[PDB]
Short mmCIF file of C-alpha atoms in Angstrom, two decimals:
data_model
loop_
_atom_site.label_atom_id
_atom_site.label_comp_id
_atom_site.label_asym_id
_atom_site.label_seq_id
_atom_site.Cartn_x
_atom_site.Cartn_y
_atom_site.Cartn_z
CA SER A 1 96.49 122.32 123.74
CA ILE A 2 99.57 120.39 124.77
CA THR A 3 101.05 120.25 128.22
CA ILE A 4 104.79 120.07 128.85
CA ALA A 5 106.44 119.26 132.06
CA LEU A 6 109.62 120.26 134.01
CA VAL A 7 111.17 118.39 136.91
CA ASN A 8 112.70 120.43 139.64
CA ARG A 9 116.07 119.54 141.31
CA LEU A 10 116.33 117.72 144.64
CA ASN A 11 117.72 119.94 147.36
CA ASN A 12 117.60 117.76 150.48
CA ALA A 13 120.44 116.97 152.87
CA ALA A 14 121.92 113.54 152.56
CA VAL A 15 121.04 110.89 155.14
CA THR A 16 124.17 110.04 156.83
CA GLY A 17 125.42 106.98 158.85
CA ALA A 18 123.10 104.18 159.52
CA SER A 19 119.99 106.46 159.77
CA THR A 20 116.92 104.93 158.13
CA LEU A 21 116.16 106.20 154.76
CA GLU A 22 112.66 104.66 154.61
CA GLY A 23 109.97 107.29 155.26
CA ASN A 24 112.47 110.18 154.90
CA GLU A 25 112.29 110.41 151.22
CA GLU A 26 112.70 113.62 149.22
CA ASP A 27 109.51 115.12 147.76
CA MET A 28 110.01 115.59 144.04
CA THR A 29 108.45 118.73 142.46
CA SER A 30 107.20 119.01 138.96
CA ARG A 31 105.79 121.96 137.04
CA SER A 32 103.52 122.11 133.87
CA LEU A 33 102.89 124.53 131.05
CA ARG A 34 99.82 124.45 128.69
CA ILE A 35 100.32 125.70 125.25
CA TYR A 36 97.26 126.29 123.05
CA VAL A 37 96.98 126.17 119.27
CA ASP A 38 94.88 127.97 116.76
CA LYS A 39 94.15 127.87 113.07
CA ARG A 40 95.36 130.83 110.94
CA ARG A 41 94.56 131.14 107.31
CA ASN A 42 94.71 133.65 104.48
CA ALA A 43 93.57 133.49 100.81
CA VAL A 44 93.52 135.27 97.52
CA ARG A 45 90.95 134.93 94.76
CA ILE A 46 91.47 135.78 91.05
CA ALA A 47 89.07 135.97 88.13
CA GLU A 48 89.79 134.35 84.94
CA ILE A 49 89.33 137.58 82.89
CA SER A 50 91.75 139.32 85.31
CA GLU A 51 94.19 136.53 84.70
CA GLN A 52 93.85 136.99 80.93
CA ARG A 53 94.24 140.78 81.20
CA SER A 54 97.19 140.86 83.48
CA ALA A 55 100.70 140.87 81.97
CA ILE A 56 102.15 139.01 85.05
CA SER A 57 101.16 135.52 86.25
CA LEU A 58 98.71 136.28 89.13
CA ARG A 59 98.61 132.62 90.38
CA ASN A 60 102.43 132.48 90.98
CA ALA A 61 102.17 136.03 92.65
CA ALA A 62 99.32 134.74 94.87
CA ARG A 63 101.32 131.61 95.96
CA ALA A 64 104.49 133.67 96.57
CA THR A 65 102.55 136.33 98.61
CA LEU A 66 100.78 133.59 100.62
CA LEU A 67 104.15 132.01 101.49
CA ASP A 68 105.51 135.27 102.47
CA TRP A 69 102.50 136.09 104.63
CA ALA A 70 102.78 132.70 106.40
CA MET A 71 106.45 133.43 107.21
CA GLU A 72 105.65 136.88 108.46
CA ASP A 73 102.78 135.47 110.60
CA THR A 74 105.09 132.88 112.16
CA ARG A 75 107.77 135.56 112.80
CA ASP A 76 105.28 137.91 114.40
CA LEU A 77 103.90 135.17 116.49
CA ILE A 78 107.39 134.28 117.74
CA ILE A 79 108.22 137.83 118.49
CA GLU A 80 104.88 138.50 120.33
CA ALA A 81 105.54 135.39 122.41
CA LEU A 82 108.94 136.56 123.40
CA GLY A 83 107.39 139.75 124.92
CA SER A 84 104.47 138.08 126.64
CA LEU A 85 103.93 138.83 130.38
CA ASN A 86 102.78 135.49 131.86
CA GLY A 87 101.05 134.45 128.70
CA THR A 88 99.46 137.89 128.28
CA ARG A 89 100.33 140.19 125.28
CA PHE A 90 102.38 143.10 126.40
CA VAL A 91 99.98 145.81 124.90
CA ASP A 92 97.11 143.98 126.62
CA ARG A 93 98.76 143.82 130.05
CA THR A 94 97.15 145.13 133.22
CA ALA A 95 98.59 146.71 136.37
CA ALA A 96 98.17 143.57 138.52
CA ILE A 97 99.62 141.23 135.94
CA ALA A 98 102.58 143.39 135.20
CA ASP A 99 103.38 144.01 138.90
CA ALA A 100 103.15 140.17 139.61
CA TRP A 101 105.39 139.36 136.67
CA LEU A 102 107.98 141.95 137.77
CA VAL A 103 107.93 140.78 141.33
CA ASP A 104 108.12 137.11 140.36
CA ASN A 105 110.84 137.60 137.67
CA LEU A 106 113.04 140.21 139.21
CA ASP A 107 115.97 137.95 138.83
CA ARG A 108 115.54 137.94 135.00
CA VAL A 109 114.61 141.57 134.31
CA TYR A 110 117.26 144.25 133.82
CA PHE A 111 116.27 147.81 133.04
CA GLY A 112 118.68 150.22 131.49
CA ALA A 113 121.67 151.03 133.54
CA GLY A 114 120.46 148.68 136.26
CA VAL A 115 117.80 150.95 137.59
CA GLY A 116 114.18 150.48 138.75
CA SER A 117 112.45 149.11 141.87
CA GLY A 118 110.95 145.79 142.59
CA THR A 119 107.23 146.56 143.02
CA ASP A 120 105.83 148.44 140.00
CA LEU A 121 106.58 148.01 136.24
CA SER A 122 105.16 151.39 135.22
CA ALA A 123 107.53 153.36 137.51
CA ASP A 124 110.35 151.09 136.43
CA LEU A 125 109.76 151.86 132.83
CA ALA A 126 109.22 155.61 133.66
CA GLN A 127 112.80 155.54 135.19
CA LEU A 128 114.24 155.02 131.60
CA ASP A 129 115.57 158.09 129.93
CA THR A 130 117.36 158.26 126.56
CA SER A 131 120.47 159.88 128.16
CA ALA A 132 122.00 157.13 130.30
CA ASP A 133 119.57 154.18 129.88
CA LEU A 134 120.44 153.08 126.39
CA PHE A 135 121.50 149.50 125.35
CA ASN A 136 125.33 149.25 125.66
CA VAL A 137 127.89 146.73 126.83
CA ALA A 138 127.25 147.34 130.49
CA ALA A 139 123.59 146.51 130.10
CA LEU A 140 124.50 143.31 128.15
CA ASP A 141 126.93 142.34 130.80
CA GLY A 142 124.38 142.93 133.55
CA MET A 143 121.86 140.83 131.61
CA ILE A 144 124.34 138.07 131.21
CA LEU A 145 125.04 138.10 134.99
CA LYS A 146 121.31 137.88 135.61
CA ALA A 147 121.11 134.86 133.34
CA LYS A 148 123.74 133.22 135.49
CA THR A 149 122.43 134.01 138.82
CA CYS A 150 118.76 133.26 138.76
CA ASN A 151 117.50 130.65 141.24
CA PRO A 152 116.43 128.28 138.32
CA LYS A 153 119.43 128.62 136.19
CA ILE A 154 119.05 129.41 132.43
CA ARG A 155 120.45 126.66 130.24
CA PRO A 156 122.94 128.03 127.81
CA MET A 157 122.32 127.17 124.14
CA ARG A 158 125.80 125.57 123.85
CA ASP A 159 128.68 124.55 126.20
CA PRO A 160 131.66 124.39 123.90
CA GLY A 161 134.41 124.29 126.43
CA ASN A 162 136.15 125.88 129.42
CA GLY A 163 133.49 127.86 131.11
CA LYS A 164 132.06 129.40 127.86
CA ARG A 165 128.23 129.62 127.88
CA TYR A 166 126.51 130.91 124.72
CA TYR A 167 123.27 132.77 124.55
CA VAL A 168 121.38 134.42 121.62
CA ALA A 169 120.05 138.07 122.22
CA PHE A 170 117.53 139.64 119.94
CA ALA A 171 117.49 143.55 119.70
CA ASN A 172 115.84 146.15 117.50
CA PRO A 173 118.02 147.93 114.85
CA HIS A 174 118.05 151.00 117.15
CA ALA A 175 119.13 148.91 120.20
CA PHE A 176 121.62 147.13 117.93
CA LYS A 177 122.96 150.49 116.79
CA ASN A 178 123.39 151.70 120.39
CA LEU A 179 125.21 148.46 121.18
CA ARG A 180 127.49 149.03 118.20
CA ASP A 181 128.20 152.61 119.18
CA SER A 182 129.19 151.20 122.60
CA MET A 183 131.42 148.51 120.99
CA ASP A 184 132.87 150.29 118.02
CA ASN A 185 135.72 152.60 119.10
CA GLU A 186 136.35 150.68 122.39
CA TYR A 187 136.65 147.11 121.55
CA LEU A 188 135.84 146.42 117.88
CA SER A 189 138.51 148.86 116.38
CA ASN A 190 141.31 147.88 118.82
CA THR A 191 140.92 144.08 119.04
CA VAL A 192 143.39 141.88 117.13
CA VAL A 193 140.70 139.20 116.31
CA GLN A 194 140.15 139.61 112.53
CA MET A 195 136.65 138.08 112.64
CA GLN A 196 135.38 140.54 115.19
CA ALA A 197 137.33 143.39 113.74
CA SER A 198 135.74 142.90 110.34
CA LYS A 199 132.32 143.27 111.87
CA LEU A 200 133.02 147.07 112.25
CA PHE A 201 132.83 147.52 108.43
CA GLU A 202 130.91 144.38 107.33
CA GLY A 203 128.23 144.73 109.85
CA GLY A 204 126.56 141.60 111.19
CA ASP A 205 125.45 139.80 114.26
CA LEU A 206 127.71 140.89 117.13
CA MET A 207 129.38 138.75 119.85
CA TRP A 208 130.04 139.86 123.42
CA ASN A 209 130.88 137.74 126.47
CA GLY A 210 129.54 134.59 124.73
CA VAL A 211 126.26 136.24 123.62
CA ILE A 212 125.41 136.37 119.99
CA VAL A 213 123.40 139.67 119.46
CA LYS A 214 121.03 139.67 116.36
CA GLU A 215 119.30 142.48 114.74
CA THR A 216 115.53 141.79 114.29
CA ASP A 217 113.73 144.55 112.53
CA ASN A 218 110.33 143.78 113.95
CA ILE A 219 110.98 144.24 117.76
CA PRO A 220 108.28 146.63 118.92
CA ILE A 221 109.16 150.14 120.22
CA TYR A 222 106.53 151.22 122.80
CA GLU A 223 105.59 154.79 122.86
CA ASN A 224 105.69 157.20 125.84
CA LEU A 225 106.81 154.46 128.31
CA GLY A 226 110.02 156.14 129.39
CA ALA A 227 111.06 159.09 131.59
CA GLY A 228 108.73 162.12 131.40
CA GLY A 229 106.03 160.16 129.51
CA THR A 230 107.82 161.00 126.15
CA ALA A 231 110.64 158.46 125.93
CA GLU A 232 110.31 155.31 123.73
CA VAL A 233 111.22 151.89 125.36
CA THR A 234 112.48 148.90 123.46
CA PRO A 235 112.77 145.30 124.90
CA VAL A 236 115.93 143.11 124.22
CA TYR A 237 115.46 139.40 124.73
CA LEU A 238 118.49 137.29 125.90
CA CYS A 239 117.50 133.69 125.39
CA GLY A 240 119.18 130.33 126.06
CA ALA A 241 118.06 126.74 125.50
CA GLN A 242 114.43 126.04 125.82
CA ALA A 243 113.21 129.69 125.56
CA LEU A 244 110.11 129.36 123.32
CA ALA A 245 107.76 126.46 122.51
CA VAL A 246 105.96 125.99 119.16
CA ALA A 247 103.02 123.42 118.98
CA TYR A 248 102.13 122.24 115.52
CA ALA A 249 98.78 120.61 115.05
CA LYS A 250 98.95 121.20 111.34
CA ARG A 251 101.95 122.79 109.41
CA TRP A 252 101.57 125.56 106.89
CA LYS A 253 99.81 124.00 103.98
CA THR A 254 98.48 125.54 100.68
CA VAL A 255 95.12 124.57 99.02
CA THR A 256 93.37 125.62 95.77
CA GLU A 257 89.69 125.88 95.06
CA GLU A 258 87.44 126.97 92.23
CA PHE A 259 84.43 129.18 92.40
CA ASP A 260 81.64 130.20 90.04
CA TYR A 261 81.82 127.36 87.41
CA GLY A 262 85.59 127.64 87.46
CA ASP A 263 85.58 131.30 86.67
CA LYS A 264 87.18 132.24 90.01
CA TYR A 265 90.29 130.45 91.40
CA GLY A 266 91.45 130.95 94.92
CA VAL A 267 94.69 129.98 96.79
CA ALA A 268 94.66 129.70 100.54
CA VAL A 269 97.49 129.15 102.97
CA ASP A 270 96.28 127.63 106.46
CA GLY A 271 98.02 126.19 109.55
CA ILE A 272 97.04 125.02 113.05
CA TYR A 273 99.96 126.02 115.47
CA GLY A 274 100.65 128.16 118.55
CA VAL A 275 103.82 129.89 119.85
CA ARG A 276 104.29 130.40 123.62
CA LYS A 277 107.13 131.51 126.00
CA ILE A 278 108.12 128.66 128.33
CA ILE A 279 107.19 129.67 131.85
CA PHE A 280 107.05 127.52 134.96
CA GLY A 281 105.99 128.20 138.49
CA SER A 282 108.27 128.66 141.44
CA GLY A 283 105.98 128.68 144.45
CA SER A 284 104.26 125.94 146.42
CA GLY A 285 101.64 125.50 143.77
CA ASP A 286 102.08 124.22 140.34
CA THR A 287 101.77 127.74 138.67
CA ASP A 288 101.96 129.91 141.83
CA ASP A 289 104.83 132.24 140.95
CA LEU A 290 105.52 131.78 137.24
CA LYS A 291 109.10 132.54 136.12
CA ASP A 292 110.54 132.98 132.59
CA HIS A 293 112.28 129.69 131.77
CA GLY A 294 115.21 130.65 129.56
CA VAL A 295 114.48 134.25 128.81
CA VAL A 296 115.92 137.53 130.26
CA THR A 297 114.04 140.60 129.13
CA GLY A 298 115.65 144.01 129.24
CA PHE A 299 113.79 147.37 128.65
CA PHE A 300 115.95 150.18 127.46
CA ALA A 301 115.22 153.68 126.39
CA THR A 302 115.69 154.75 122.69
CA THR A 303 115.39 157.71 120.29
CA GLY A 304 113.93 155.56 117.53
CA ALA A 305 110.49 156.03 116.07
CA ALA A 306 107.90 154.04 117.95
CA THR A 307 106.15 151.23 116.04
CA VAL A 308 103.40 150.96 118.62
CA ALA A 309 101.02 153.77 119.34
CA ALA A 310 100.90 155.54 122.64
CA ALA A 311 97.26 154.32 123.38
CA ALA A 312 98.13 150.76 122.35
CA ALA A 313 101.29 150.46 124.37
CA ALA A 314 99.66 151.94 127.47
CA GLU A 315 98.78 149.83 130.51
CA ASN A 316 95.16 149.16 129.91
CA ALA B 1 74.48 127.27 112.54
CA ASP B 2 77.81 125.56 113.02
CA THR B 3 78.55 122.60 115.17
CA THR B 4 81.27 123.11 117.86
CA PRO B 5 82.46 120.73 120.55
CA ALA B 6 81.26 121.27 124.09
CA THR B 7 83.38 123.15 126.46
CA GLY B 8 84.05 120.07 128.51
CA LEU B 9 84.73 118.00 125.43
CA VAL B 10 87.79 119.94 124.28
CA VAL B 11 90.60 117.51 124.59
CA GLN B 12 94.03 118.43 126.26
CA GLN B 13 97.11 116.41 125.55
CA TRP B 14 99.96 115.76 127.93
CA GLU B 15 103.62 114.94 126.90
CA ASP B 16 105.48 111.98 128.38
CA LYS B 17 108.90 113.90 128.18
CA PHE B 18 110.04 116.33 130.79
CA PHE B 19 112.63 119.08 131.09
CA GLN B 20 115.47 119.06 133.54
CA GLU B 21 116.99 122.03 135.48
CA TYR B 22 120.50 123.23 134.37
CA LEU B 23 123.10 122.49 137.05
CA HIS B 24 126.73 123.59 137.02
CA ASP B 25 129.07 120.79 137.99
CA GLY B 26 131.88 123.13 139.29
CA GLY B 27 134.46 121.56 136.96
CA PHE B 28 136.30 119.85 139.83
CA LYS B 29 136.38 116.51 137.88
CA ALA B 30 139.19 117.77 135.73
CA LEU B 31 141.38 118.36 138.84
CA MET B 32 140.87 114.92 140.29
CA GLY B 33 143.81 112.51 139.99
CA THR B 34 145.90 109.97 141.75
CA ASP B 35 149.22 111.71 140.94
CA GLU B 36 151.34 113.29 143.61
CA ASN B 37 150.82 116.92 142.27
CA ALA B 38 147.02 116.56 141.80
CA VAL B 39 144.92 119.59 143.02
CA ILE B 40 142.34 117.11 144.35
CA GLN B 41 143.78 113.82 145.64
CA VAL B 42 141.66 110.70 145.10
CA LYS B 43 142.38 107.93 147.72
CA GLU B 44 140.56 104.79 146.71
CA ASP B 45 142.36 102.58 149.14
CA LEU B 46 139.42 101.93 151.26
CA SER B 47 137.49 100.38 148.38
CA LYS B 48 139.56 97.19 148.79
CA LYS B 49 140.54 97.29 152.48
CA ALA B 50 138.49 97.73 155.64
CA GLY B 51 138.10 100.93 157.65
CA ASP B 52 136.23 104.20 157.90
CA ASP C 1 122.60 139.24 101.63
CA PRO C 2 125.18 136.67 102.17
CA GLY C 3 124.27 135.60 105.75
CA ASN C 4 124.92 136.15 109.46
CA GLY C 5 122.89 139.42 109.34
CA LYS C 6 125.11 141.02 106.71
CA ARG C 7 123.15 143.38 104.50
CA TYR C 8 125.00 145.44 101.85
CA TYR C 9 124.21 148.78 100.18
CA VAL C 10 125.96 151.24 97.95
CA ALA C 11 126.18 154.90 98.91
CA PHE C 12 127.09 157.57 96.33
CA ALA C 13 128.38 160.84 97.84
CA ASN C 14 130.05 163.92 96.59
CA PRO C 15 133.78 164.36 97.26
CA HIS C 16 132.91 167.01 99.96
CA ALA C 17 130.49 164.56 101.75
CA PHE C 18 132.96 161.80 101.18
CA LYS C 19 135.67 163.97 102.77
CA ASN C 20 133.37 164.69 105.68
CA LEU C 21 132.65 161.00 106.24
CA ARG C 22 136.38 160.26 106.09
CA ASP C 23 137.17 162.94 108.58
CA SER C 24 134.65 161.35 110.92
CA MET C 25 135.98 157.87 110.23
CA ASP C 26 139.78 158.25 110.17
CA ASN C 27 140.92 159.41 113.62
CA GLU C 28 138.38 157.18 115.36
CA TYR C 29 138.29 153.71 113.52
CA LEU C 30 140.55 153.27 110.56
CA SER C 31 143.73 154.23 112.35
CA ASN C 32 143.38 151.43 114.90
CA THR C 33 141.73 148.39 113.05
CA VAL C 34 143.82 145.37 112.38
CA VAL C 35 142.17 144.87 108.97
CA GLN C 36 144.82 145.39 106.29
CA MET C 37 142.54 146.70 103.60
CA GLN C 38 140.74 149.28 105.75
CA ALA C 39 143.90 150.33 107.38
CA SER C 40 145.65 150.74 104.00
CA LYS C 41 142.61 152.85 102.87
CA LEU C 42 143.92 155.51 105.29
CA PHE C 43 147.03 156.19 103.15
CA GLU C 44 145.70 155.04 99.82
CA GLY C 45 142.25 156.71 99.95
CA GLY C 46 139.93 154.11 98.37
CA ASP C 47 136.13 153.71 98.56
CA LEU C 48 135.01 153.53 102.21
CA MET C 49 133.07 150.75 103.96
CA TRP C 50 130.95 151.12 107.11
CA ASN C 51 128.17 148.83 108.44
CA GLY C 52 128.01 146.92 105.19
CA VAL C 53 127.61 150.15 103.17
CA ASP D 1 155.67 124.06 137.50
CA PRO D 2 157.05 124.03 133.93
CA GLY D 3 160.05 125.99 135.05
CA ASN D 4 161.20 129.33 133.73
CA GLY D 5 159.75 131.09 136.68
CA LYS D 6 156.22 130.11 135.79
CA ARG D 7 153.99 128.79 138.51
CA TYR D 8 150.30 127.95 137.95
CA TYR D 9 147.27 127.92 140.25
CA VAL D 10 143.63 127.40 140.00
CA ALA D 11 141.07 129.87 141.36
CA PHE D 12 137.30 129.40 142.09
CA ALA D 13 135.11 132.49 142.38
CA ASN D 14 131.44 133.29 142.29
CA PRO D 15 129.85 134.71 139.05
CA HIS D 16 129.63 138.10 140.88
CA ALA D 17 133.19 138.06 141.90
CA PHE D 18 134.15 136.79 138.49
CA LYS D 19 132.13 139.61 136.85
CA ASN D 20 133.91 142.19 138.95
CA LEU D 21 137.33 140.54 138.09
CA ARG D 22 136.42 140.55 134.35
CA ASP D 23 135.35 144.13 134.63
CA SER D 24 138.78 144.99 136.02
CA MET D 25 140.47 143.00 133.31
CA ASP D 26 138.73 143.59 130.09
CA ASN D 27 138.85 147.56 129.75
CA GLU D 28 142.66 147.42 130.25
CA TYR D 29 144.21 144.21 129.15
CA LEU D 30 141.96 141.91 127.29
CA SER D 31 141.03 144.60 124.76
CA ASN D 32 144.63 145.57 124.07
CA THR D 33 146.88 142.34 124.14
CA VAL D 34 148.00 140.83 120.94
CA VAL D 35 147.52 137.30 122.38
CA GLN D 36 144.78 135.63 120.28
CA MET D 37 143.68 133.23 123.02
CA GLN D 38 143.11 135.98 125.56
CA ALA D 39 141.84 138.56 123.12
CA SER D 40 139.15 136.19 121.91
CA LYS D 41 137.89 135.80 125.45
CA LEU D 42 136.63 139.40 125.22
CA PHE D 43 133.88 138.04 122.94
CA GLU D 44 133.67 134.30 123.52
CA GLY D 45 134.25 134.54 127.32
CA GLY D 46 135.30 131.73 129.64
CA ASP D 47 137.63 131.23 132.48
CA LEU D 48 140.16 134.00 132.86
CA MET D 49 143.94 133.74 133.21
CA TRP D 50 146.14 136.17 135.06
CA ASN D 51 149.75 135.78 136.45
CA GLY D 52 149.53 132.09 135.89
CA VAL D 53 146.33 131.63 137.85
CA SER E 1 108.26 152.24 76.39
CA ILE E 2 108.40 149.22 78.72
CA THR E 3 106.59 148.28 81.84
CA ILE E 4 107.89 146.67 84.91
CA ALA E 5 105.77 145.30 87.84
CA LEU E 6 105.95 144.88 91.63
CA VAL E 7 103.69 142.76 93.83
CA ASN E 8 103.01 144.19 97.18
CA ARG E 9 103.18 142.01 100.35
CA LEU E 10 100.01 140.80 102.21
CA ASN E 11 99.34 142.57 105.51
CA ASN E 12 95.98 141.29 106.61
CA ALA E 13 95.19 139.75 110.05
CA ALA E 14 95.04 135.93 110.12
CA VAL E 15 91.65 134.38 110.06
CA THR E 16 90.54 132.47 113.14
CA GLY E 17 89.72 128.86 112.87
CA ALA E 18 85.88 129.33 113.25
CA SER E 19 85.84 132.55 111.18
CA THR E 20 84.86 132.11 107.49
CA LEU E 21 87.58 132.67 104.93
CA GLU E 22 85.31 132.00 101.78
CA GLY E 23 84.44 135.56 100.69
CA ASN E 24 86.75 137.34 103.14
CA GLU E 25 89.81 137.06 100.96
CA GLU E 26 92.53 139.76 100.65
CA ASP E 27 92.96 141.61 97.44
CA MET E 28 96.47 141.70 96.12
CA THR E 29 97.77 144.99 95.03
CA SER E 30 100.10 145.16 91.96
CA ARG E 31 102.10 148.37 90.93
CA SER E 32 103.50 149.22 87.54
CA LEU E 33 106.29 151.55 86.27
CA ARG E 34 106.54 152.77 82.57
CA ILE E 35 109.96 153.48 81.41
CA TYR E 36 110.27 155.40 78.15
CA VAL E 37 113.15 155.46 75.77
CA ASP E 38 114.31 158.27 73.65
CA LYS E 39 116.95 159.08 70.95
CA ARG E 40 119.96 161.14 72.18
CA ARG E 41 122.56 162.32 69.80
CA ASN E 42 125.33 164.87 69.34
CA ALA E 43 127.40 165.87 66.31
CA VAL E 44 130.58 167.86 65.50
CA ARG E 45 131.13 169.37 62.02
CA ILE E 46 134.40 170.74 60.84
CA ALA E 47 135.28 172.44 57.61
CA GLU E 48 138.21 171.64 55.35
CA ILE E 49 139.88 175.01 55.69
CA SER E 50 139.70 174.69 59.44
CA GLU E 51 141.26 171.27 59.07
CA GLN E 52 144.06 172.87 56.95
CA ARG E 53 144.72 175.69 59.45
#
């Protein structure tokens, strides 16, 4: 494990005149976050006779599939970390953990159409219906406002000039389609900017209010978490600078080994690492009221097919 | 069996670098000037003379 | 797959399905866009483009 | 005061008040004007300009 | 006929650091498609009297 630190700002009134500054110093506050690492490996073993029989090269196929598996594993770990509730996986969340996270992160959570209370996450998700709680321009603007009004401000990924602050949003293809339906005949088809107008036909990453919205196909769709217990819910993640942390004790490396007097040949890919969402406390203690450092999470209803089973996505 | 380190012998590492909170500066520095039509007037005359 | 999330596909449709798609696309998008090629397709009637398809 | 009846002022507002002003501005003006600098602010964002302010 | 091949992706859970990988490997699946070829032909025959007429 590795521990990273954040230093809070000083918010004390200035000592004016000839008043003594000795003994009236400001108490600096610091916060810590511990990120664990783990070893993840996969392997493929091929027999020599199977290599001779096969028309294609099985060693190259094994290497390519292992590299693709490593990339997929890293992507899945990052996506899972993006949706973690105080370090706990969303599908493995409890009522107490979810309620505490919602209460302590109410300045960074925006449900569809700006609905929801501030005490229970289950009811807040149950307020989401596919009719008016989709992902649109209004929801994105509300999430951007939330990113600019939290007590610990979220660092924009870039500060290019006069008041422009950039962020990156990750959304599912269904949420991306909803945003495109909100942007298509209102702003994209009427704007005079050629770069943004072309995106209506040559679809790509969208831009709105300084936020670059990206279509990630592996954002989970939780089943039966919406209104009436039958509406699917999808999270959209608006991230600035310092949103996630990846610790690398050993990068992805490939090894080869021989078995059974050289008859069998195995290729393995292994790596020691860990991906976490940067969260810091906000209360008196070091980790009293943990807050999402650089991530705004928005839950929106959707009509897409759920990628997570109803029992798996339930509040266990 | 397999040898594993003791629970209290698992090492945790700390980093010597720290993050800083993001602060908006307001953008008033662009409006400061010594010209007559400056939005914010800077009077540095007391840096060389005496008086409060 | 050039980049910036751009993925391209080719759709083959009958003239009737193509006419239905153009009827859905013309009074809403193609009539207002500033893109010269797509705007010209309204009067010239070429192959359509939508969402990279 | 560059003349020609143009007078410029600065304005400072909170992010909530700025969001309200942008909501009033974007659906009517920013999405329709042919001025590239102001039209691009619909997507890039930034400080707004209205009546020289 | 000719044969083309596809190699499926690996979709197994990652092995924990203390778990044993030697013997718990994942079997790669490979798929094949057989494309046949055939002789297609068509002919037209015309008589000399029909050529004259």
